[PDB]
A paper describes a structure:
To assess whether cat MDM2 is also regulated by S429 phosphorylation, we generated cat MDM2-422–C-S429E and performed autoubiquitination assays and UbcH5B–Ub binding analyses. We showed that the S429E substitution enhanced the activity and UbcH5B–Ub binding affinity compared to WT, suggesting that the pS429-mediated activity enhancement is conserved. To further validate these interactions, we also determined the crystal structure of cat MDM2-422–C-S429E bound to UbcH5B–Ub. In this structure, the interactions of the sidechain of S429E in MDM2 resemble those of the pS429 phosphate moiety in the MDM2-pS429-UbcH5B–Ub complex: the carboxylate moiety of the S429E sidechain in MDM2 forms a hydrogen bond with the K33 sidechain of Ub and coordinates a water molecule that forms a hydrogen bond with the backbone amide of Ub’s T14. In both structures, crystal packing is facilitated by residues that precede the RING domain and that are unique to cat MDM2. Our structures and biochemical data suggest that the location of pS429 or S429E with respect to the RING domain is important for optimal hydrogen bond formation with Ub’s K33.
Author numbering:
A (entry chain G): 429 to 491
B (entry chain L), F (entry chain C), K (entry chain F): 0 to 76
C (entry chain K), E (entry chain B), G (entry chain H), L (entry chain E): 2 to 147
D (entry chain J), J (entry chain D): 428 to 491
H (entry chain I): 1 to 76
I (entry chain A): 423 to 491
């Protein structure tokens, strides 16, 4: 089944869409906006969901 | 001032907020902000014809609620 | 390739481009025919131009083969209907659909590339005698596309 | 703002699997294909289908 | 998944079962089309029934998705071609192949379970009037599978 | 009397020593001896149809050098 | 922080948890009260335990301050109701909602860490005489949480 | 049979299990679906941590019960 | 009762039926019997997810890494 | 990949039956004897012949 | 670096990838990986003498393509 | 016993060992004869030692009885040719073959156990004067093994 929750707002700010993909290795957890995710990476926090370190934040478009 | 629509490469339709005096270069900048596509890979088509960068929407008689068609930059050869 | 091709056919039934139509020839889903209407305010105005489409077995990673079957006067299309156009080869993208390819080809009719031409004689006329270019293209439109 | 309603639509290449293969280039990513299809493009050294930027990596994208 | 899928396809090329065929249409190995001939001496005899097969990316650890595209009258298969069969869900085995799955479905055609059906109306008729059941399934085979 | 063949689950083919009067359940117990598969997990198929436990090979027109097809126990529902 | 807290409150109302309950004390959305049901099959069984919650202004980037207001016998919870627990400190996650924090705290009751205790005397007892530990913990539950 | 797991964000997923599934079997299936390593998973039912080494039948966990996923934690 | 010859496992050199690549060294044990048709890597994946034996559906007691001296 | 061509040869003890008696110890096994011969070893409390670990069990081993 | 051969207990010959500075104990570890034999029950013989876990292959002037011989740990008495 | 012994003989024919040779004494497959080359860099260098081998009825569950018939000087072999060696008694293994047994015996020559000896006199001389032992062994080798 398909990602119906991807339409829901960022779980952190509950305001902006989920367009800040949190990347680690070849996998990523997409559940937050670019602003909130960039904050985590700026402060060297790990991924909120899997606790892996954050390799990068990718601004994610759905073309 | 007016709304127009762009049918993007995947078939998804987006809405832009434009002026008649907006250049095509300007429109592509807005598509870049919404979709993450550099303007030089954008080719806009209206009534079967491509829209040149330095000409305005109104130079092509593109009015409120028109639909532009986005394809990929191409080169006859 | 099949389910992608069926989706493209559904989109052509529901919301096709203004100048462009296409569908399977018979029951062969990998062999289509297409039409492009000559754009208004252009030497092709009032002509209808037929094309042949063959989808390769690993469409859409590989581009369709696209050729005119209607003769047409243009610097990047020759007498056999072969179209020299980068999105049909090295600049193909798998996000392009037949609908988008046809619209693209439609935009090429009005915006030729005479600087890297498939038919050099027609390109010279296009660059230096646009009155005669428009005239001959109009004549070919009446002779072959009406 | 506008939320991505087209995210539940299938991969635009195979028209079957979910959109979970994010195509990364620089700081942006285009998510319109499944991981299997996007990976095939990366292995064949193809650019991004929608913007033609070189593909940096394909990210298997989860939606927690 | 691909290598396993390629081995199954080669097997079908060299030694298919009598009743069943399947393969990809293009180069897309994850999407197959299949056919099952209605078994002799059944309501389905003389019919050819098309199915669609989608392999998940962790095949063969997870089952293929299999659905009829030809309409068939049967208590465990509904008007969308959905097949309520345990080896397609909780009783899948990685040792099953598409060949064995098609053969299993084929054996389900003449051994339905009306006591726990997908289509209640058809199970009632199967239990309370076998002749009418055979009449109808025969008419459906003639109408849709020929 | 005669040999038959059984295409097992993995595609491997085995040879069985049978009388035409042997029951289907007899054949399954032979498959268990050869392959370690419990008879209640064996579904044998011939001419597109499963073979019932209390019938004989002759009850199914199974001749010598016939091939039976072994799949897993299944339940429609 | 406000929008995220409001979201959590509405989620709690739309979908109340089985093991805990929580909401604002009156008007201040940053100060909440909560209740934890003691785990069945434990010394805390049948007890109901109250807690206070203060959200910092950069919640959920920073953890909420969470303390018991009902006395409870545990090596990692002291007479101030303070809870020494890594997810409230350095192992916090912005994806933890207050419902998840409360369920996590509840699971800590039967999963104490006596080797790094907040109340050494309770932990020594836990490590040397377990039946003596359970006896007392049941006593405190009946004295203070019923 | 099927059970539910309410994951960290509140999203609910479905798992295919047997009564003999151990809790580590369950965490492995959660990782398959959600890409969360098992050693940062903590599963809770009826207010108690479920322990690696014990099975769903050991905990009498019912078909279509819901297990609650939080993050690995430690008191101190 | 006729004389029965021993028969030897010629299919033992075929690759794992799951990955079609690696040798059959992952033995699936249940009771006092084993079904050896997958590599250790593929069989451990079944065991780690408590899936049954693929050919007989008995529960997988243990996977044995099998050497052939 | 080195495939076990020697799995097809007879039991190294009786040289007559196939190698269907796996000698199990922990999570590894040595397969070189038939079931009958390997049970004799287990019955007599002998260790594994090639590695000298104790014999946990003999598993009758099929190649399906 | 180089490769060598080990004749195992049944006579089956196997191949290892080693460096001339590898310890005897290091070779036995690679033998344990391929054959499941604990090193403390391995006895490697070369030129009729036992090889001791401290030395290396160069110590014993063991060139590439040499065959080492494996028996079981033994002790006179 | 017989088939296994046969097998060991064929394998000897296929891959002849370099430190030793062995085969049946004429007609009796259960009575064998063997020779060992004395190791280089050792006091047995250049010697050829003969051994007698007898297989019991339940070979290979029980070890062969192996004794030297060439006199030799060594703490773990006595004047009757008896070899006190653990693999020939309690540490036997059915995977051992005559070839492996002989090579094992050859490596015992340069790896004696003086601390639990068969011949104490030779043992004491091995511990206290290594130089004497090698002189004597070389002499015994020259006297008896050429
Ligand atoms: Zn946000
Ligand atoms: Zn993550
Ligand atoms: Zn795809
Ligand atoms: Zn892109
Ligand atoms: Zn495998
Ligand atoms: Zn099995
Ligand atoms: Zn044997
Ligand atoms: Zn062993």
């Amino acid at each position: 089944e398909f990602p119906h929750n991807a339409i829901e707002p960022c779980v952190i700010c509950q305001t902006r869409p989920k367009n800040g993909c949190i990347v680690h290795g070849k996998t990523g957890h997409l559940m937050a906006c670019f602003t909130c995710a960039k904050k985590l990476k700026k402060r060297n926090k790990p991924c909120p969901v899997c606790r892996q370190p954050i390799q990068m934040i990718v601004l994610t478009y759905f073309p | 001032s007016m709304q127009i629509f762009v049918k993007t490469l995947t078939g998804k339709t987006i809405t832009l907020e434009v002026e008649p005096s907006d250049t095509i270069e300007n429109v592509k900048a807005k598509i870049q902000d919404k979709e993450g596509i550099p303007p030089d890979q954008q080719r806009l088509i209206f009534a079967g014809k491509q829209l040149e960068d330095g000409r305005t929407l109104s130079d092509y008689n593109i009015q409120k609620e028109s639909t532009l068609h986005l394809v990929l930059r191409l080169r006859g050869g | 390739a099949l389910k992608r091709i069926h989706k493209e056919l559904n989109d052509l039934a529901r919301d096709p481009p203004a100048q462009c139509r296409a569908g399977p020839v018979g029951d062969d889903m990998f062999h289509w025919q297409a039409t492009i209407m000559g754009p208004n305010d252009s030497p092709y105005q009032g002509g209808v131009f037929f094309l042949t489409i063959h989808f390769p077995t690993d469409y859409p990673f590989k581009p369709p083969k696209v050729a005119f079957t209607t003769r047409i006067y243009h610097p990047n299309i020759n007498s056999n209907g072969s179209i020299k156009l980068d999105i049909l080869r090295s600049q193909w993208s798998p996000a392009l659909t037949i609908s988008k390819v046809l619209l693209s080809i439609c935009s090429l009719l009005c915006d030729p590339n005479p600087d890297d031409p498939l038919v050099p004689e027609i390109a010279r006329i296009y660059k230096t005698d646009r009155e005669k270019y428009n005239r001959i293209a109009r004549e070919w439109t009446q002779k072959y596309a009406m």
